[PDB]
Structures are given as structure tokens and as C-alpha cells.
Design a protein around this ligand. Sequence first.
Ligand SMILES: [Cl-]
Ligand SMILES: [Cu+2]
Length: 122
Amino acid sequence: ADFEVHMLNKGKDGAMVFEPASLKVAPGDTVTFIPTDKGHNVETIKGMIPDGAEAFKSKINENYKVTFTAPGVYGVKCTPHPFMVGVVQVGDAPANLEAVKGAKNPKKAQERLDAALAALGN
Ligand SMILES: [Cl-]
Ligand SMILES: [Cu+2]
């Protein structure tokens, strides 16, 4: 299956956001990150992806597609916007949950990550 995540200045969930900011996918599914507004990108957060997964980074304004196969949670961020974060999860019972959950990001960013993990049923 293929999914889209849009990058927005303001969305359903607030300002500088990925929409949706949480997505549960099956191994082999893809996500394309699509700028709806100018000035955003996506990159994996250091330490916040599964073993077996590769880090990634897009260019500002780039439509950027990633295939997710390794099970677990994937923390993503937009480089210029400190609170603009999200989580993609592959499968159930992610093994690296604490890499995201126990992290020490700015409160607004961390709340967004934590709410994403909670919405994913963790
Ligand atoms: Cl593009
Ligand atoms: Cu952004």
C-alpha cells in the first residue's frame, strides 16, 4: 500500500505539521512526503529508526518517497521547523519504542512524538 504525508504550515493538528503525523503501515508499504506549503523537508531523527533501517533526508520542497520494510517506529522531522515531527510505524509491537518515547527533545516536539506513538496504539 502507498500513503501520503503532507507538510503544512498549519493543519488539523496545528502549526508546522506533518499530516498525518502518525502512520501505521505494513512491511513493504511506501510513504510519499509531499509539500503542500513551501519551506519544508523530511529527515529521520538520529537514533529513532529500527535496526535494519536506513536514514534519509529530502530537500526543501521535494516530493520524497520512502519504502518501509524493517519493523519498528521511525521518528521523522522537518529540518527548519523544530516542532514539526512525526512517526511512521511498521508492524505491531515495535522493538525500538523507547528510542522515541524516552527521548529528550524540546517539550513541544516531544509531545508531538509521544502523541503520535499513542495514536499508533503503543
Ligand atoms: Cl520533487
Ligand atoms: Cu517544516
